[PDB]
């Protein structure tokens, strides 16, 4: 009962007074028995919140501001003691409270996850408890430019000094704990607005998803602040020299840190591919095209002017609409008579991991400042140039073992980590000849292919769609790299025999199921399919034997459902879809399968003035496709008036007439 809660909160408040405080003689000063008090607070975390599965101490500690107002002052001033002394060299004791402060920071910043196994109290407290971690992330990054980060690296340097031979299990743990601190500080991200669904929605939905507490802004949490404070505390230098020193107890958290940096940033944002103002002018012109389009869809006189059109149909019957512009344009009248319907078909629905490229909105960029972009890109450049192959070899040499116990989070973060840096180095090398494909050579060592294949095959068999999607992404970048090294030249021939049979079948069956899943799932299926087809064509066991496994209606449904988002897709993705159509329809000549009205509607909606950019290369491809498509449909209808009705339906799987429908003799 809540009496226990007020007793708890009272205890935590008294402990908050025991830690320390400012001294007017302003400087922060530790309390008497400070180490015992910090130990008792750590005890409270284990004793209550872990062992009873509560998070009540984790809430109370935020209420009484212990992290922001004691522990960060302690760590920053201890860092100042050690750094000022380092130029000049009872520290042997104060080092202990600094370590225990870092332990408490790792506890209070520990990434919260809620599942079915989480307690009722935990899932109740989750939403507000996340907010205090966001305050912690802000304060950790901002306070004295984040000098606590320098305190953390000093605590790590104080075991890196003693040899690889010297470091005890406790020293190894301390280094791993510092990595968990950096990982946590990166990893905190705003929570999701978790609505109760017992009671029906009112006449207005949710007012806003915003979960940030009032003293936080999303810019405080943005990657710009992380990169700035990490650069100004040389965290990047620490990580680079740490991975340079890898010659493996800590390898999983270090991998995890690189995942947590990469997980939501797009590689091409780090490359250009008055300039900002010029581009603003370009943006304004692009939306002005939409203005001159919506103007034609707008009444030239006021809304109450209200002249009535009547559409007489081809039969002796009449419809009526009020569209003032529609009086001179039956196109508008028809689509308005369609939009007038009150009816809509009812539509259908559909956690222990963070948001990422796996599930963001497809165009969701991160807006680096130029200095932060430079600092981040040079850091990951130096990482590729030093740490990639050894770290990937280290963690994959682990992960070939213990696959059965590889938790889902660990799987998805590993696959995404692999894919992101492979894609990045390919892009940097396509930009600069000075950058080497072989600097990510560990990707191609067959152990890696075997592991990623095992993860994809197992996740598909286990119907783990999350890891399935991530392994699909990893396969896309692996095949991308493989095609590049095929041009750069043996391993290409080797994998080009290993992905035979069962792997062909599995890859063929991802886009059969993909139509049921989110837009990013479908996008990754399409991307994989294009990569697979270009790889197999570069090889070209038989080409027709493989591609026939793809050319079937469930795959076409995935392609159409992906293409329904054309306004929100990128031009290159439309190009990829229409190149697939180009092969299937023009070259492979299974043209019957695309004579279906969903495509017809979609073609008109994007070729309409309300659709694609007039000067778009993808518009050029859709126009080029559509002329030939209409010509072929005209031919088939002239040869088959039955196909006027067949256009409406799935084609006939009763082969005895199905062949005739498909080809028409």
């Amino acid at each position: 009962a809540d009496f226990s809660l007020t007793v708890l909160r009272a205890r935590i408040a008294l402990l908050a007074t025991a830690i320390g405080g400012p001294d007017y003689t302003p400087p922060y000063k530790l309390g008497d028995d400070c180490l015992a008090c910090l130990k008792d607070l750590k005890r409270w975390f284990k004793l209550v919140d872990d062992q009873q599965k509560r998070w009540d101490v984790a809430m109370a500690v935020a209420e009484y501001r212990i992290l922001t107002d004691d522990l960060l002052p302690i760590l920053i001033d201890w860092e100042n003691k050690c750094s000022l002394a380092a130029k000049l060299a009872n520290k042997a004791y104060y080092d202990k409270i600094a370590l225990n402060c870092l332990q408490l920071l790792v506890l209070m910043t520990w990434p919260l996850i809620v599942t079915e196994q989480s307690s009722s109290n935990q899932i109740t407290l989750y939403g507000e408890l996340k907010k205090h971690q966001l305050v912690y992330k802000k304060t950790i990054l901002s306070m004295e430019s984040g000098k606590v980060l320098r305190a953390a690296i000093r605590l790590a340097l104080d075991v890196i000094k003693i040899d690889r031979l010297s470091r005890t299990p406790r020293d190894n743990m301390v280094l791993k704990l510092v990595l968990n601190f950096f990982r946590n500080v990166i990893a905190i991200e705003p929570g999701e607005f978790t609505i109760n669904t017992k009671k029906s929605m009112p006449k207005k939905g949710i007012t806003s998803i915003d979960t940030l507490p009032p003293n936080v802004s999303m810019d405080d949490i943005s990657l710009n602040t992380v990169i700035s404070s990490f650069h100004k505390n040389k965290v990047f230098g620490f990580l680079l020299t740490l991975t340079s020193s890898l010659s493996d107890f800590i390898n999983i958290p270090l991998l995890e840190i690189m995942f947590y940096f990469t997980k939501d940033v797009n590689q091409e944002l780090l490359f250009p591919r008055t300039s900002a103002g010029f581009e603003l002018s370009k943006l304004l012109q692009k939306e002005h095209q939409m203005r001159k389009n919506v103007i034609k869809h707008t009444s030239a006189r006021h809304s109450r002017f209200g002249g009535l059109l009547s559409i007489q149909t081809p039969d002796k019957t009449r419809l009526t609409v009020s569209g003032s512009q529609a009086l001179v344009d039956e196109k508008i009248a028809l689509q308005k008579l369609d939009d007038s319907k009150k009816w809509n078909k009812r539509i259908i629905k559909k956690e222990g991991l963070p948001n990422s490229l796996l599930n963001s909105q497809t165009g969701k960029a991160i807006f680096f400042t130029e200095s932060n972009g430079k600092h981040f890109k040079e850091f990951i450049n130096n990482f590729i140039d030093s740490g990639f192959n050894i770290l990937l070899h280290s963690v994959t040499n682990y992960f070939t073992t213990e696959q059965d116990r590889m938790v889902t989070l660990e799987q998805v973060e590993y696959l995404l980590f692999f894919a992101w840096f492979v894609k990045y180095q390919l892009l940097r090398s396509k930009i600069d000849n000075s950058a080497d494909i072989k600097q990510v050579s560990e990707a191609l060592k067959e152990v890696t292919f075997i592991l990623v294949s095992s993860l994809l095959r197992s996740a598909y068999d286990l119907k783990n769609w999350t890891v399935t999607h991530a392994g699909m992404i990893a396969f896309n970048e692996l095949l991308n790299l493989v095609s590049r090294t095929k041009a750069a030249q043996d391993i290409e021939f080797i994998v080009s025999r290993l992905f035979s049979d069962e792997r062909i079948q599995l890859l063929s069956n991802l886009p059969k199921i993909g139509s049921k899943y989110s837009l990013q799932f479908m996008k990754s299926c399409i991307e994989l399919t294009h990569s697979v087809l270009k790889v197999l064509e570069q090889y070209s066991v038989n080409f027709q034997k493989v591609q026939a496994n793809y050319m079937t209606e469930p795959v076409i449904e995935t392609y159409i459902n992906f293409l329904e988002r054309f306004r929100e897709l990128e031009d290159d993705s439309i190009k990829k879809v229409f190149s697939f159509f180009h092969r299937v329809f023009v070259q492979a000549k299974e043209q019957a399968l695309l004579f279906r009205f969903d495509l017809i509607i979609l073609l008109r909606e994007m070729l309409s003035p309300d659709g694609l950019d007039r000067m778009s290369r993808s518009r050029k491809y859709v126009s080029q496709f559509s002329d030939y498509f209409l010509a072929r449909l005209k031919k088939r209808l002239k040869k088959s008036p039955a196909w006027f009705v067949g256009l409406l339906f799935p084609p006939l799987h009763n082969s005895e007439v199905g062949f005739y429908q498909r080809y028409g003799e």
């Binding site: 939403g127 607005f193 978790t194 109760n196 017992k198 207005k204 979960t211 009032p214 109450r304």
Partner: protein, 258 residues
């Protein structure tokens, strides 16, 4: 705005506000059943200084003496109270529509009762209407600091040097009097008096509370042939915080206060 739920102590925060007083539609707690039962947390929520001011078309800009057209201007934050009644001002900011917030649905208010717009689900059968208002982010007017430091420390150093080159002149006193009312010829004694009126005496308060007048009262007796009103036109044109009035046109009340 920021609200605490009635049936559980959870808090919604950073709630943006429409023109109506806007309360949250859903409880953030996945356990909770609440909709639309709330208490506003006055301490966590943030208000802003707000002030409506009504302006009318300038008297010299009306085309043929018809009625002046009017507008409602909203001032906020640091920009409030810079306007004043009867002041002539220049504002800049946003031209905005302001809905009839009663018609839009509002806690504790029965709706009000030109044809509006309807069909919007919040309105049901009602039809919404809009006034125009101007959300002004900036204001200036376009129509006694009696300590040396608070005056001097506002000046440009150029102005400081002009002041120094003026006080250096031993016979500036003559130059001041000849700078009074330069468009009227002669009458040195009157000009000297007007100088010694804009330069007042030092107002004093006695230990007993009895005040002594500092201001200086001057009379300029003259035939209607004399260039007499020129002095009043000059000093009302020149001197800050001054007025012109005519003896018979103004009554006793009209002079002191009505």
């Amino acid at each position: 705005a920021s609200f605490t739920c009635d049936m559980c102590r959870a808090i919604v925060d950073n709630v943006e506000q429409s023109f109506k007083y806007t309360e949250p539609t859903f409880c953030p707690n996945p356990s909770c059943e609440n909709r639309a039962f709330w208490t506003l947390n006055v301490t966590r929520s943030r208000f802003l200084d707000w002030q409506k001011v009504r302006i009318q078309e300038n008297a010299n800009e009306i085309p043929t003496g018809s009625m002046p057209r009017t507008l409602d201007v909203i001032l906020r934050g640091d920009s409030v109270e810079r306007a004043k009644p009867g002041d002539r001002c220049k504002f800049t900011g946003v031209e905005i529509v302001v809905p009839d917030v009663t018609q839009l649905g509002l806690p504790g208010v029965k709706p009000s009762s030109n044809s509006g717009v309807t069909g919007l689900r919040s309105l049901g059968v009602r039809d919404l209407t809009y006034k125009i208002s101007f959300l002004a982010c900036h204001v200036i007017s376009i129509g006694n600091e009696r300590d040396q430091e608070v005056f001097l420390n506002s000046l440009s150093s150029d102005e400081i040097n002009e002041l120094k080159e003026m006080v250096k002149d031993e016979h500036i006193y003559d130059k001041l009097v000849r700078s009074i009312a330069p468009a009227v010829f002669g009458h040195e004694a009157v000009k000297k008096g007007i100088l010694l009126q804009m330069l007042g005496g030092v107002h004093k308060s006695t230990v007993e509370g009895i005040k002594l007048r500092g201001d200086i009262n001057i009379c300029v007796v003259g035939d209607p042939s004399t260039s007499k009103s020129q002095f009043l036109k000059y000093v009302v044109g020149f001197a800050p915080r001054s007025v012109y009035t005519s003896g018979k046109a103004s009554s006793a009340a009209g002079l002191t206060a009505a």
